[PDB]
Amino acid sequence: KVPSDIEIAQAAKMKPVMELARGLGIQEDEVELYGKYKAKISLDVYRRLKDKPDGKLILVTAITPTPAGEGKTTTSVGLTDALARLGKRVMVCLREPSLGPSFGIKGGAAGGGYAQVVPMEDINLHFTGDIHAVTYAHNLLAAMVDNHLQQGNVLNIDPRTITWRRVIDLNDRALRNIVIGLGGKANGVPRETGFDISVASEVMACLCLASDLMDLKERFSRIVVGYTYDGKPVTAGDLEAQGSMALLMKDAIKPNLVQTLENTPAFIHGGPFANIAHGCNSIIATKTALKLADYVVTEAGFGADLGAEKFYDVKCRYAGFKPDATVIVATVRALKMHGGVPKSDLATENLEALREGFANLEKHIENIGKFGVPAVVAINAFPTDTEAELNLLYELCAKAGAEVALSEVWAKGGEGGLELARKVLQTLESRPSNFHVLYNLDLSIKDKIAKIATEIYGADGVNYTAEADKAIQRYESLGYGNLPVVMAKTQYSFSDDMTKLGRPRNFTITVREVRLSAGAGFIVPITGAIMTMPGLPKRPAACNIDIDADGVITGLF
Amino acid sequence: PSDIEIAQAAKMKPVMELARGLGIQEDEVELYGKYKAKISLDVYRRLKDKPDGKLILVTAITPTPAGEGKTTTSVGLTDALARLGKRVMVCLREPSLGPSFGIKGGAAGGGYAQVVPMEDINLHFTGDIHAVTYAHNLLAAMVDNHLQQGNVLNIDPRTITWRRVIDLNDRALRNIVIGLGGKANGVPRETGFDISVASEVMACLCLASDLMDLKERFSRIVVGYTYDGKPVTAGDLEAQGSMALLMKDAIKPNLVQTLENTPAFIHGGPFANIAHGCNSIIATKTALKLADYVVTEAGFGADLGAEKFYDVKCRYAGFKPDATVIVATVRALKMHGGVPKSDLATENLEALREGFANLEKHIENIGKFGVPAVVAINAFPTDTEAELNLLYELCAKAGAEVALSEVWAKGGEGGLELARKVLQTLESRPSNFHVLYNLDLSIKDKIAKIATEIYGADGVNYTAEADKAIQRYESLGYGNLPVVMAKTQYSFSDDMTKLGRPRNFTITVREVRLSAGAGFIVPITGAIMTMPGLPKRPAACNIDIDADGVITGLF
């Protein structure tokens, strides 16, 4: 039956977004069209609706990711569509993908099968230009740092201490480690630096956490770019770059209105990393959506150990949100992997490995409970699952105190989400959340790291390299010790060992390096090497991509 | 009032209205807000055989520190023709984002002769330069990946000519070493960045007839050589499909308007030394179907811009220009006379007489292409009636039509006199347009012929490396292409100190490069700056935007 994803998206019948906007009560003068199927919405909408009550907030997350796949964004869109079919006034908020993966391995739908947000091609490529804005704001700041050095280095920056790198939204490993400023005294100051992928930009994290354009500007001014020869921090504010950065971002600060295949309205805005940042879409989008709709579905990157924790402990903390429910997406195949089944043997029924791997899901369920939010499990249907596997999984979920629903939104769209949506609505009606963040900001950096590691990951404790120790001590000294902590860890395990699937016990986390994102406003302890600039593969999708005289595009998906 | 203030007070029409009034259908228009739109290439496809309207090129005398107000005149001439009831469009280039944060940030034109919205034009506009940046940098990333993945094509990394780009003025990126850190992180090599508007991809955009032609052009880009000296192309790396996809939208021209609501296209914006300096063929050829009269321009003085416009752009498109306006000021011709910038407030008839020899050569030059010239003296409230008159006369004695243009001060009415000579020149002076040279000449013959016929040089000299470079390009089958001289713009000669109409001199070619995708050879007479730097006190430092959205420091 089910066609390909880009085939689905082509056949979609989209409504002009201006109709969707007026439907939400957005005014014609608050809408800036980019063609008829995308628009940017003014932050005036939030402002004039500021005192209206917020709708219900539903976070979508998942179990620990595996080679088998779990179907998270599909579930988000699918849930949204199901709620809409049930007559609810609902929006979904999602992240904008990086352009780079399209030319490497991907791209793919924002969702999958009959649960997508569209127009798909635009979303994956330039979209409404937000990532270009991020790239240029970021690179303007770098240009200004370098120029400052060139013009006599009045601030007395030690160039060898500059932490502000450059960015580009392509997978280019050759830009990871470079030396710039060569050619003699007319051409700058020789120095060691490199590029990260644009979506890894602190500027991106800033956008996603800012309340408005003036807040974004303030955050920009606090960005630490390096140190003086005496060891004092130097900021973007010190270089007077924040006004120009803000200006470059004056349209990017607006969320982008688009829609599902079933024409349910959707915002796509921002898209940070989920290891060195918090892996959520913008506060601006979510807060606007909550005034416009009675129900808002959003998601966070990686498993619930990373994305959900940071959704709660960073985004919600800054925004004042109080999530009402949380859906945890899981699959039979993924859980079997967590119970030791290799990828090649996942179709074979194995109730014992499913029982064992469920320990992964159980721990995520427990963890969501620690923030005082009620949890509902969404089981992404797959053709090879047996009834016996599914029934065991349902019984294990009920034993764990969680509602569970089979989701077939991939194949059946919103119709496939009705059971999940109803379980969510029953949860919202009978188990009000009692949301609270996991940790108080006035704890020490180590105390905060240990709360997260021991309570969420199940680690025994946390070890530190000498370099991590010195970094922590300096940041505490410079006055950055009361910030949130953003753990950069493998997503593939509760531990910092990617080979420890399931629910590992008797392990310790090792923090090797600690970095500062002073603009986004958090500390970033790092457990293993983090790939801030992925590379292209032997055979990049770019080689197979074409477009013909009729504008038909092959090789993209 | 300031240019931005004028710009703020413009009563802009919704661009859709302008589009339907041009006979563009709704489904052929892609809005970016109310006041910008992209126009589909199906407007040209379906009007393929509707007749072309008249083509007017606006060029200028040799640039100087005095400024000559070429764009201002192009826009003003367009508003004039609109006032005289004609169906007219102006086509212009898109400016780089970089200058906004360095020195500049200017109007598209000046005073009461602008295209708007000025602010969006100067920044991200409709994103075409980001598409350029990414198409270019993808190819580079693909080159580098190819090396890392076993170097199947056997590229010598040290010969790679394909640099990267970014649209900011950043001198620290001119010369860099990439690919550091080990086995896992690429292959160490020397390279650098250029400003995005300098990219060959930008030159390709502006010379492509349609997206499939743009693709084919991409495939022919030369990115480096094998260890055996064999050229390696973007076609060899299977990049052209991805590059074309990235440019899917940027291939469409952008409909905006003048202050008086005359329709304008802005599309493309290449360099005028290492490239031809015109807006896209796509915009001009579309406008030509939508309007009876199309006004457009080319970068730098008539010796670079106009020549390249005739010998590159019209050649590839098969346009036959009907008239060319040479813009000139009194302040400028004075400097060609020898008057230092500081004394231009004085009158000086003898120096304006001596400086005229610049304008006189340009006029002669236009006539070698079979195009009827028309002079516009751009009127500056410093100019004395005796000065203007001396100029009026001199044009008339040199044999050319000329008008005074007060479009900066008065808008479209400022340009009615000019626009009457233009129309009078079109009604009753039919051009006999022809390119300056045949593509079948050697490379040296074609350069010689530009150098002697257009710059008035005694001849041309070559360095050994330029000789070597030429011999090889000819050996590799590239000797039948148009030449695009990369030279200083501030003299017909290659020495920038020589203003006026210098005699008894030679052009030295120091280096020669290749743009196989854009379709041309680029002889170079001295260092060309392809990545400008920020100044001691950048505009960025004083730019700000407040809670109400009011922007300061930008213009």
Do A150 and B173 lie within an 8 Å CB cutoff? no
Interface test with A, best of B185, B545, B550, B554 (most A CBs within 10 A): B545
DSSP 8-state assignment for residue A54: P
Tell me which chain B residues have a C-beta less than 8 angstroms from the C-beta of A551: 211, 248
Q: Own/partner pairs for B12-16, CB < 8 Å, 24+ apart? A: B12/B116, B12/B117, B12/B257, B12/B261, B13/B257, B13/B261, B15/B255, B15/B256, B15/B257
Best interface-test mutation with A: which of B189, B238, B252 has the largest number of A CBs within 10 A?
B238
How far is the alpha carbon of A251 from chain B, nearest alpha carbon, in Å?
A: 10
Instruction: Give the number of residues written for chain B.
Output: 555
- The H or E element that residue B394 is part of is helix B385-398
Q: Is A109 annotated as a binding residue?
A: no
Residue by residue, DSSP assigns A316-362 as IHHHT----EEEEEE-HHHHHHHTT--GGGTTS--HHHHHHHHHHHH
Can you give the resolution of this entry in Å? 2.1
Establish whether the linkage from the previous residue to A107 is cis, with ω within 30° of 0. Answer: yes
Q: Which three-class secondary structure state does DSSP give residue A110?
A: strand
Question: What is the crossing angle of helices B330-337 and B385-398, to 10°?
Answer: 80
Task: Provide CATH code, domain A130-248.
Answer: 3.30.1510.10
Q: Which helix (H) or strand (E) holds A86?
A: none
Q: Determined by which method?
A: X-ray
CATH 3.30.1510.10 domain span(s) along chain B:
128-246
Tokens of residue A76, six digits = 């988000």
Tokens of B413: 């009415």
**Distance, CA of B122 to CA of B106 (rounded, Å):** 7
A539 to chain B: nearest residue by CA?
B149
Asked if A555's CB is within 8 angstroms of B241's CB, the reply is yes
CATH topology of domain B442-531: Formyltetrahydrofolate synthetase; domain 3 (3.10.410)
CB contact under 8 A, B171 and A188: yes
Determine contact, residues B49/B42, Cβ cutoff 8 Å. Answer: no
* Nearest chain A CA: its distance from B19 CA (Å): 15
Annotation: CATH topology of B128-246: Domain 2, N(10)-formyltetrahydrofolate synthetase (3.30.1510)
Q: In this complex, do B246 and A32 lie within 8 Å of one another by their Cβ atoms?
A: no
Chain A CB contacts of B545 under 8 Å are: 213, 217, 243, 246-247, 250
Cα of B400 to nearest chain A Cα, Å: 45
Helix, strand, coil percentages (3-state) for chain B, rounded to 5, are 40, 20, 40
Q: Which of B101, B176, B536 sits opposite A180 (nearest CB)?
A: B176
Name which of B123, B137, B238 is nearest A170 (Cβ-Cβ).
B137
CA distance A252 to chain B (A): 11
Residues of chain B found within 8 Å of residue A244, distances taken between Cβ atoms: 101, 540-541, 543
Q: Would you say B156 and B224 are in contact if contact means Cβ atoms under 8 Å apart?
A: yes
Q: How far is A532 from chain B (nearest CA, A)?
A: 12
Of the partner residues A32, A547, A548, the one whose CB lies closest to the CB of residue B33: A32
Residues of chain A with CATH 3.10.410.10: 444-533
The C-alpha of A214 sits at a distance from chain B's nearest C-alpha, in angstroms, of 6
- Shortest distance between the Cα of A430 and any Cα of chain B, in A, equals 42
C-beta atoms of B171 and A150 within 8 A: yes
Residue type, A535: G
| Shortest distance, CA A499 to any CA of chain B (angstroms) | 21
Q: Do A182 and B170 touch (CB under 8 A)?
A: no
Is residue B368 marked as binding? no
CB contact under 8 Å between B127 and A129, yes or no, is yes
Whose CA is closest to B132, among B78, B62, B205?
B205
**Cis? peptide before B340, omega within 30° of 0:** no
Known catalytic residues of A? 72, 74, 95, 106, 274, 302, 382, 410
How open is the CA angle B356-B357-B360, to the nearest 5 degrees?
90
Cα distances (angstroms) measured from residue A477 to each of A218, A232, A470: 22, 11, 11
**Residue A234: closest CA among A160, A328, A312, A175:** A160
Residues from chain A that touch B553, judged by Cβ atoms under 8 A, are 243
User: After which residues is the backbone of chain A broken at C–N > 2.5 Å?
Assistant: none
CA distances from A356 to A368, A391, A402 (A): 20, 15, 18
The H helix count followed by the E strand count for chain A is 20, 24
Is B70 marked as a binding-site residue? yes
Q: Which long-range contacts (CB under 8 A, 24 or more apart) does B179-183 make?
A: B179/A174, B179/A177, B179/A178, B179/B144, B179/B147, B180/A176, B180/A177, B180/A178, B180/A179, B181/A176, B181/A177
* Probe site for chain B from A30, A182, A198, A221 (most B CB atoms < 10 A): A182
Give the position of tokens 């230009």.
Answer: A129
Chain B residue with CA closest to A152: the answer is B536
**Please, which residues bridge with residue A60 across strands?**
A299, A327
Are A544 and B238 inside 8 Å of each other by CB?
Answer: yes
* Pairing label, strands B29-32, B520-524: unpaired
| CATH 3.40.50.300-classified regions of chain A | 1-129+249-443
| Measured torsion, CA atoms of residues B316, B318, B324, B326, in degrees rounded to the nearest 10 | 10
Q: Which two tokens stand for residue A437?
A: 């963040």
Question: In this complex, which of B31, B169, B211 lies closest to A33 when CB atoms are compared?
Answer: B31
Q: Is A87 annotated as a binding residue?
A: no
- Inter-chain touch A243–B549, beta carbons under 8 Å: no
Sign, Cα dihedral of A511, A515, A516, A517: negative
Q: Give the chain A residue whose CA is nearest to the CA of B30.
A: A35
DSSP B190-240: EE-EEEGGG-HHHHHHHH-SSHHHHHHHHHT-EEEEBTTS-EEETTTTT-H
Q: Out of B145, B185, B189, whose CB is closest to A177?
A: B185
B119, B145, B163, B210: best to mutate for the A interface, most A CBs within 10 A: B145
Backbone dihedral region of A17: left (phi > 0), alpha (psi from -120 to 50 degrees) or beta? alpha
**Residue ranges of chain A assigned to CATH 3.30.1510.10:** 130-248
- Crossing angle (nearest 10°) for helices B443-453 and B464-475: 130
Peptide bond into B117 cis (omega under 30): yes
Cβ separation B172–A179 shorter than 8 A: no
Contact B137 A214 (CB under 8 A): no
Active site members of B: 70, 72, 93, 104, 272, 300, 380, 408
Judge: A188–B211 Cβ closer than 8 Å, yes or no: no
Asked: is A1-129+249-443 a CATH 3.40.50.300 domain? The reply is: yes
Asked if B170 lies within 8 A of A142 by C-beta distance, the reply is yes
Determine whether the interchain pair A243/B180 forms a contact, defined as Cβ–Cβ distance below 8 Å. no
Q: Out of B138, B168, B178, name the one closest to residue A139 (CB).
A: B168
A-chain residues near B544 (CB < 8 A): 243, 246-247
B1-127+247-441 has which CATH code? Answer: 3.40.50.300
Answer for the pair A174, B187: CB distance below 8 angstroms, yes or no: yes
Q: Which of A142, A140, A148, A279 is nearest to A205 (CA)?
A: A279
Dist. CA B541–CA A377, nearest whole Å: 52
Chain A residue with CA closest to B101: the answer is: A244
Chain B interface mutation, best of A30, A98, A106, A147, highest count of B Cβ atoms under 10 Å? A147
The answer to whether B552 is a known ligand-binding residue is no
CATH of A444-533, one of 2.40.160.20, 3.30.565.10, 3.10.410.10, 3.40.50.720: 3.10.410.10
**Which residues of chain B make contact with A129, given a CB cutoff of 8 A?**
124, 127, 130
DSSP codes, B152-175: TT-B-GGG----EEESS--GGGSS
